[PDB]
Structure formats: C-alpha cells, structure tokens
Amino acid sequence: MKILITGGAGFIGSAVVRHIIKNTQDTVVNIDKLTYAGNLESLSDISESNRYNFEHADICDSAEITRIFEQYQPDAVMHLAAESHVDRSITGPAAFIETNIVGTYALLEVARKYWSALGEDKKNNFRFHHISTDEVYGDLPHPDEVENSVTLPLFTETTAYAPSSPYSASKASSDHLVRAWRRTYGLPTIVTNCSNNYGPYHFPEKLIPLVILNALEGKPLPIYGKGDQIRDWLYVEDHARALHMVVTEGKAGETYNIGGHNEKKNLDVVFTICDLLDEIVPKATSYREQITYVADRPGHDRRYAIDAGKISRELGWKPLETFESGIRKTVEWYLANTQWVNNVKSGAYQSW
C-alpha cells in the first residue's frame, strides 16, 4: 500500500515514517516543507530505502500537491503537517492559520478530486487519515476541584469541542473541515486525537527534552507554578504504531482517541527524570538540586487525560510502554544522541 504522509520530517511524522519502513510492507512518499520544525536527520537511517520518497513541498501549494498525488497514486493519506508556533505576521497570515486551516482545506480539495477520479475498487479502499490533538476538547476537572475519591472525567470521542488557545482552535477547525468533506462529498476520512507525545527526536527546547539536557548542562530544571498541570503522556513509538493500525484498519467516518493510559503532574515528570538520571549517570550531587520553580502561564488548561477505550475495543490497540518504561528509554536516547541534539542547537540540521 502506498501511503502519502505530510509532516514526515517532524517529531511524530518521522516516527511514523521510520515505523512503516522498518516494520511494514508499505511504501511512503513524504511531503514536508521543512520549516524550523523539520529535520531530515531524524529520517537518516531510512532515507535510502527504495520504499521511501521525499517531496519538498508546502501543503498550501495546490499545483505541486496535485502533481504529487497524480504521480504517486497514493492508496491513503496521513496528514500530520501542522504549525505549532503561534506567530503574528505583519503583512498577512499567521503561519499557523495558513498551515493548519487553509493547508488542511487545500489538501482536502486535492484529495477529493483524486479520490473521485479513482476506480470503484481503489476508491472504496482509499482513506484520508487526519492526525489531531486532545487539546480540541478544552479542559477537564482537576483533582483538587473534585473532592476526595470521586472518579474524574476523561476525554472521549464524544466530548464537546472547546478550544482554548489559537493553536488548539486552529486544529479543532481542521478537524471540522475533515468531517464535513466526508459528510458532504463522501470522502473517506478518519480522525484521531492524541495526548502529549514524548520520546526520541523530540526537539531540545521541548519540556521533557529540556529538563533532561539542562539537567546535564548543570542548569535550572523548571517546574511551572505548582507543577500542577496534568497531562497524559504517550510514547512516540506507541503513537506511531496506533496511527498505522488506524490507517490500515480504521473505519471511514470514525474517530479514535489515542493516549498512553496514564496521567501525570509536571512536578512528577521532572522528579522522575531526576531519579532516572541519578540511577544512570550518577554525579557529585543530585540533579534534583537544580530544580527551581518558575512563572506560571495565565489561564492554562489544568488537566488533559484520554480515555482510549474505543480504539482498544474496536481495533485492539494499547500502548506497549508505561510512562515509567518510556521515560527511561527517552533519557537513554538523549544520553546516546548528543550529535543529533547539537546539530539542532547549532542550526546545522537545516542543511539537509
């Protein structure tokens, strides 16, 4: 099966691509415009495969995307390209509106023409799988708002949308566009919403990687506000496996939430990392001593937690890692990958 993937040089995207090439019979054409977020080095031990093809393009460029579809005759699409940085363009567009909304619209129109011009067989098997975030659901009650032993609510596929940031609002919109094209034109679409990913090849400035690296450089490990914030951490390699499962076995018109089956406070994440770093790599003092509390960010969602029961029940997917086993692997990865980290920090990675 040939899978056309957008955002393939990204954090999650690269995990998806590496998975398909290393563990499946499928082939992939990766469409990525390589913004500051893309990294071809994250695909380095896969880019020589004859089952992999790279196309340097912007999903907003219809002409180019149309060409690529016509040339590769994809059996399915996995849409991961997105802008997570909220900017403020002078002239016009803010990249996140352009890429996340207009880009999804643009891609949907190319895929619609392509799909409708297919033959009965290939047309009934085609799938447009849209990758999204749990942030579209808004916020959940926090443990300290609900008093003693009351079972807290979880995000399910029928939880109402309630975006609270420009980024999540832009993703919620792309979600709506994907579902409307299905109901209006009959396009084969599927939508998945996942929680926070962590793991190998995550950029240096991200939360978990930042704690691990600052720890090592003898710098401040920040805990924001009370370290209050609750998030459901999903290991990237697990997300990657769920996504391929969904695109190949997912049912058109369905939605699937994906999560790591856990819930953790930021403070717990920082401490867990320090404990691992004390076990592996011991030193003259505990890494804990660099922990420092810092600024809180205004009206931020207090708790995200996903109920992944549906995907388990219907497709049989469950994470293979636990936060414990996953975090350990992550720390080990950063310790063994200084080169990759340094190329990102120096900018060297943007030279292909």
Added chain:
Amino acid sequence: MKILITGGAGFIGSAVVRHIIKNTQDTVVNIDKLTYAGNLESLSDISESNRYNFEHADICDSAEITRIFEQYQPDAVMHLAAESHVDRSITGPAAFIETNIVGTYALLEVARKYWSALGEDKKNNFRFHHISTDEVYGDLPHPDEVENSVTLPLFTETTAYAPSSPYSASKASSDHLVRAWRRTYGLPTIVTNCSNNYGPYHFPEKLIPLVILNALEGKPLPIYGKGDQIRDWLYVEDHARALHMVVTEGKAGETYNIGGHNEKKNLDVVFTICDLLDEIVPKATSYREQITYVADRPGHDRRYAIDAGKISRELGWKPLETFESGIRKTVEWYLANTQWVNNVKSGAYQSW
C-alpha cells in the same frame, strides 16, 4: 455607545443597523466590502443619519480595519460579515475560507490590539460580539425516527459541535477562534448562534422569498424530498432586537442560542405561504395548486431546532412574532417592495 458592525449591508446586518438607528441612542459605523450579497438599498432609509457611517472595506484588510478602529474608537463590535456561498479556488483559499475563517482571525487581531490599548474604564466595557449559526451543532433526531411521543432533543449552548458542510465548518471555526482569544488574551468576546432567519430584505432566490415570488408569478412551487426537513424559523427583526440586547447586556465569555421558538417542515412553510396568499391577493384557484414535487439533495441535515431558554432566563429575550404573524408580515413586505426586488434581480442594486 459607538458600535462597529461588519456585514452591515447584508440581510441580517441591515436589520441590525436599521434597528439601532431607528430605536436606540447608539451610533454605528458599518464596515462592508459589498459582495454580491451586500445591498446599500436595504439601508436607504437610514443612510443619511449623522449617527450612521459607512466604510467600504474587506475585513481581511488589516491596515484598513486598523485605521477604522483608530478613527472611530468603537465601544463594541458586532461581527456579522460572512460568505455563505461555497465556491472553489483556482488560486488558493476559497472565499468562504478567507472571509469566514481568516477574516475572523484578522478582525480578532485588530480588536485585540485596540482593546489592550484602551483605558481601564472603556477596556472593561468593551465587547466583541460574534454572530454565528445553529448549523455548528450538526443535526438532531427527526420526528419520524424517534417513534411515538418520546420528545425530541434541542440545540442548547452546551451541545457538541459537529459541522456537516464546508460552510458550517468554516463558521464553527470562527467560533473557536473567538473563544480562544477570550481565554488566551482576555478579549471581551460573546457568541450567539441562531436558527434560520426570514423576513424583509431577504434576497429573491432564498427559500421563502422564492416561494412568495414564484407563487404570485403563477409559477410552480417545487418541493424537494417529501419536504421532510425541519428548521426553526426566526423573524429577522426579532433576531436584530436580540442581538442589540446581547451586545449591550451580554456577559463576556457567554454563549446565547437564538431562535423563533418553533419548528417547521418545509412543506408546512410552503403551505403556510400559499394559505396567506390565498387570503390576501385571493385567487379563484388556490395557490397550493401550484405546489409540485421534484427530487432532493443528498445527505442533508434533517432537523434543526433551538432551545432559546438561556437567553430568555438570563437576558429576558423572547420573539415578538410567531411563525404565523411573521410569515404574514413577510408576504406583505414582498407585495409592497417590487422595486427593491427588481433592482436585485436586474443587478442595478450594485451601483450604490
């Protein structure tokens, strides 16, 4: 209070402007780019008021919109400008995406900067009122599916978003942007979702106007499916009153559903108009004789119905009209405004 309004030359927009000038102490600056949908003639008996100002501009034009805010220093904003025709683009984003989504984003950014630079007093009183549709809610169970006297569901402010067309998807997105700006930047925003509007100044090709005009012209009154579709009809003048009520008394961060407190099948609408045209402008033969059956559009939402209890309970608003009294006023209006109708049909209205 100076109210800045977008889409003021449109169907609903013109009703809002006329209402503020005829029945309030407030002043208004109307920003409209005058697409095929705008009609300055609909504002003719109000355009000379010194309390009214017109600005010919596109909401996507940030420089222009910024100048306008700075010049009129608005106490509030009523955003009604939107593109309801779903077109396609041989060059990037279609109009509805540009106007409904990007345009709302653009407007939000100008209003944010303006608002944050106000002055404690005027800054706490400022309001950004976003006008939207009940279509964002998806579809409701139809009478013929929910057997016997069960009782059917209604759209409430907490009903889950589930857009099923490109248009409704674009409006649902503008809604998400509006709320995120509030939660993220603290912008005073409000959102209202209303049902199908009908009444004076509704373009000739619209459903109700078309039935009235075709009927008198003696032409056929075609019905699509079994005339199954159910909709909540809200008289435009009623909507106009609710909107002003909301912008002046509405609470920041709140959502209000607005409807005509009714539910009607299309077949009932056609029959109701024929009955009235038989009463007024009586004809030996009955106007139903003209009713005929054609085919109908695929997978369309079967039932929209709004629960307008919250706005009643909290702001004390209720429709003054009933579907019956309102349809009567509408028929009388068309019979009395051949000139307006003909100027729209000929294109002459687009000469200012």
